[PDB]
Amino acid sequence: LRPGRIDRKIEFPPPSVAARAEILRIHSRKMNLTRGINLRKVAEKMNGCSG
Amino acid sequence: MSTDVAAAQAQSKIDLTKKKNEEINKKSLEEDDEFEDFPIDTWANGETIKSNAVTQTNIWEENWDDVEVDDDFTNELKAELDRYKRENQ
Amino acid sequence: SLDDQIFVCEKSIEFAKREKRVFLKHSLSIKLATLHYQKKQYKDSLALINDLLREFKKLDDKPSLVDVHLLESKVYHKLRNLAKSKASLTAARTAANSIYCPTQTVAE
Amino acid sequence: RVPNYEVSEKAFLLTQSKVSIEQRKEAAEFVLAKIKEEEMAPYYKYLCEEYLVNNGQSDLEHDEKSDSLNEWIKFDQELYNELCKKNESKIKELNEKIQKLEEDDEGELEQAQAWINLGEYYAQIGDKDNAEKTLGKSLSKAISTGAKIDVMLTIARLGFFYNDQLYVKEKLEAVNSMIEKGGDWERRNRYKTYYGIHCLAVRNFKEAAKLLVDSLATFTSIELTSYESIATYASVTGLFTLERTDLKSKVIDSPELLSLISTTAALQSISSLTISLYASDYASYFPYLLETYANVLIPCKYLNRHADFFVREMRRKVYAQLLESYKTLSLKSMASAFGVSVAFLDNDLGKFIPNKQLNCVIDRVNGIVETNRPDNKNAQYHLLVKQGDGLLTKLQKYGAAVRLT
């Protein structure tokens, strides 16, 4: 843990509304795209605690 | 078309420059093409419609309505004729 | 007569969304749909179900519309397609996780 | 782009004279109202050319015969005058706009949508050629890839509209090459519908049966003829390709066919034939067949030419179905159930046995129809030997050229 013989510490966040939306986008193409666009809805509804 | 699989004979046997002299010389012995002797004396061949209904200009595969004529009218009538026979059996 | 019942509801809903609150309106729309199912015209019935589902999905928490989903099972049962009755059956059940709401609903 | 599928049907009815005459003049009233309104005179010019000496033989700028039984058909110069105004005013507005958005930057999308607007208007009035030219201009321009695909099917509709299938195959060949470029599942459902109608025209229905039921399962029937028409088509093809076992499964059981019921006549006749085949009532099958030719096959633009073929094949299916079940029948019992007499039975079987499908005999002497359809070692042998003869044929053929050189 003690730095300067291991460098850099980077902390991942529990995902934002913005992050959730972008993660959601890439898999939903692989799936099926909802008619009327309800990809916007999901991220509003809840933000996960992890990705 | 031609005997057997046409497409199979077409792919096997193709022109080379070696066969090219042979293919002409053979044709010359069958006294020209004998398919440009044809349209001259008929002054233009027509179409088959005498017993075809979907003729021979189909853009999908031909049926066997090319040897038969419209049989739905005969069916309609047989039906009706049969109803009097059974009525008065 | 069926026609008599239909007409009574048809008059009431107009008089139930212009002088009285929203709550009243969708009461008569449940009843009217049920009566086109007595009439066995299902297209009329699907139309009122469609009004119910779109306008009050942002207000869904009611025992009223558990029934509306049950009414689709009945409409789709008679048109003889069970693919879309089993769907609307789950729709009613999930939305009827409010299971301490009335006894009749639970029997249907 | 919208009114195209509707108008195309109604005009096609006019051409026919194997339908009710009553139906034609209801169609004629409607179709002409819309020709005045949406300025469809190019398309009218095209339609009269294609008739010709069946219909349009009651128009003023043509020669008048007793071939048309309609008279509400009347092509005049009044249509033409309206064309000139409505086209001049619109085209000109859209031309000035394209060159405006050359000035604006990121203008590629902006010009694409304007040239689409132009391609709609030429679609509206007729012209497949001018939409084609303009929506290729849209094609080069930066637009979303899903829009490119949509554009290409937009031109294909135009080949249906005109009534030339050979245009449509080239226009769906481009779609087949672009499908996975967008990878869109959104335009995949659209492609099943277009390509389904196309494969309904082809003799082979095999591709069509699979397509036309996916079109039932996923609710896509748009920018093309109605859901009820979609269903009608599914039934015809279902019947032609699928065996009796797979028929119940896929056609008579379908949530989508049952839920849509039969509210139209076309859909009613075809479904009625299918129900009576399985239920094994053959005395309702024959009248129902005649209903089929009248109200489905002949009013359609892709079964017009398979109208005779389906009549015939269906009589063939049912006979053969019965001959599986029975090693002996009498002419009398068989004829009575089919609703034809014995003489009438002879002649219909007398085509179908040389078409190699029913494999039976007829006695006139004893009057029994015996069945001569093997299923055993003889059937196995006939089939297997042909394919191995087919291997030998390629082997001779393919070997001979390589040696020769």
Supply the angle between the helices C66-78 and C85-95 in degrees, to the nearest 10.
170
DSSP B40-56: HHTTS-----SS-SS-S
- With an 8 Å Cβ cutoff, is D180 touching chain A? no
Structure tokens that stand for D356 in this block: 């190699």
φ/ψ of residue D329, rounded to 5: -145, 165
Which residues, 6+ apart, have CB-to-CB distance to A31 below 8 Å? none
Name which of C37, C32, C34, C1 is nearest C14 in CA terms.
C32
CB D155 within 8 A of CB D129: no
Structure tokens that stand for D2 in this block: 């919208």
Query: A32, D185: Cβ pair inside 8 Å?
Result: yes
DSSP D357-376: SS-B---SSS-EEEB----S
Rounded Cα gap, residues C45 and C31, in angstroms: 10
Query: B65, D308: Cβ pair inside 8 Å?
Result: yes
DSSP 8-state code for residue D353: T
Scanning the structure block, which residue is given the tokens 């005999």?
A: D361
Rounded Cα gap, residues A15 and D401, in angstroms: 68
CB B59 within 8 A of CB D165: yes
Task: Tell me the shortest Cα–Cα distance from A21 to chain D, in angstroms.
Answer: 20
Please give the span between the terminal C-alpha atoms of chain A, in angstroms, as a whole number. 25
Query: B68, D393: Cβ pair inside 8 Å?
Result: no
Chains touching B, CB cut-off 8 Å, 3+ pairs: D
Query: C76, D259: Cβ pair inside 8 Å?
Result: yes
Rounded Cα gap, residues B85 and D147, in angstroms: 64
User: Which chain D residues contact residue A29 at CB under 8 A?
Assistant: 183
CB C68 within 8 A of CB C52: yes
Structure tokens that stand for A3 in this block: 């730095």
Q: Find, in chain A, the residue whose alpha carbon is nearest to that of D189.
A: A32
Q: What count of residues does chain A have?
A: 51
| H/E run at residue D330 | strand D328-330
Provide the 10 A C-beta neighbour count for residue D360: 20
Query: C81, D255: Cβ pair inside 8 Å?
Result: yes
Q: What count of residues does chain D have?
A: 405
CB B48 within 8 A of CB B55: yes
User: Which chain C residues contact residue D261 at CB under 8 A?
Assistant: 79
When scoring C41, C81, C82 by the number of chain D Cβ atoms within 10 A, the one with the most, hence best to mutate, is: C81
Our answer on whether C and D touch (3+ beta-carbon pairs < 8 Å) is yes
Rounded Cα gap, residues C16 and C20, in angstroms: 5
Rounded Cα gap, residues D197 and D165, in angstroms: 10
Rounded Cα gap, residues C40 and C38, in angstroms: 5
Q: Find, in chain C, the residue whose alpha carbon is nearest to that of D217.
A: C83
- Candidate from B13, B54, B82 with C-beta closest to D344: B82
CB D273 within 8 A of CB D239: yes
Query: A33, D185: Cβ pair inside 8 Å?
Result: yes
Supply the angle between the helices D129-140 and D108-125 in degrees, to the nearest 10.
170
| H/E run at residue D328 | strand D328-330
Q: How many CA atoms lie within 13 A of B56 on its CB side?
A: 9
Provide the 10 A C-beta neighbour count for residue B40: 8
Torsion of CA D174, D179, D181, D187, to 10 degrees: 120
> Residue A17, Cα to own-chain centre: how many angstroms?
8
Chains touching D, CB cut-off 8 Å, 3+ pairs: A, B, C
Rounded Cα gap, residues D31 and D52, in angstroms: 18
The structure was resolved to a resolution in Å of 6.1
CB A27 within 8 A of CB A9: no
Name which of D117, D85, D84 is nearest D98 in CA terms.
D117
Rounded Cα gap, residues D323 and D45, in angstroms: 53
Task: Tell me the shortest Cα–Cα distance from D248 to chain C, in angstroms.
Answer: 14
Sign of CA dihedral B1, B5, B11, B15: negative
Scanning the structure block, which residue is given the tokens 């179709």?
A: D31
DSSP 8-state code for residue A50: -
> Strand, helix or coil at A9?
coil
DSSP C23-61: HHHHHHHHHHHHHHHHHT--HHHHHHHHHHHHHTTTS--
User: Which chain D residues contact residue C76 at CB under 8 A?
Assistant: 259
Q: What count of residues does chain B have?
A: 89
- With an 8 Å Cβ cutoff, is D186 touching chain A? yes
Look up residue D229 and give its amino acid: S
φ/ψ of residue C74, rounded to 5: -70, -45
Rounded Cα gap, residues C33 and C40, in angstroms: 10
- Candidate from D203, D311, D398 with C-beta closest to B60: D203
User: Which chain B residues contact residue D204 at CB under 8 A?
Assistant: 60-61
Our answer on whether C and B touch (3+ beta-carbon pairs < 8 Å) is no
Name which of D305, D308, D310, D315 is nearest D350 in CA terms.
D315
| H/E run at residue A32 | none
Task: Tell me the shortest Cα–Cα distance from B60 to chain D, in angstroms.
Answer: 5
φ/ψ of residue C99, rounded to 5: -100, 5
Q: What share of chain A is helix, strand, coil (3-state, %, to 5)?
A: 40, 0, 60
Structure tokens that stand for B61 in this block: 């595969």
Rounded Cα gap, residues D231 and D212, in angstroms: 8
Q: Find, in chain D, the residue whose alpha carbon is nearest to that of B4.
A: D393
Query: D344, B78: Cβ pair inside 8 Å?
Result: yes
Rounded Cα gap, residues A21 and D142, in angstroms: 26
Provide the 10 A C-beta neighbour count for residue C65: 23
Task: Tell me the shortest Cα–Cα distance from D257 to chain C, in angstroms.
Answer: 9
Name which of D226, D228, D156, D241 is nearest D194 in CA terms.
D156
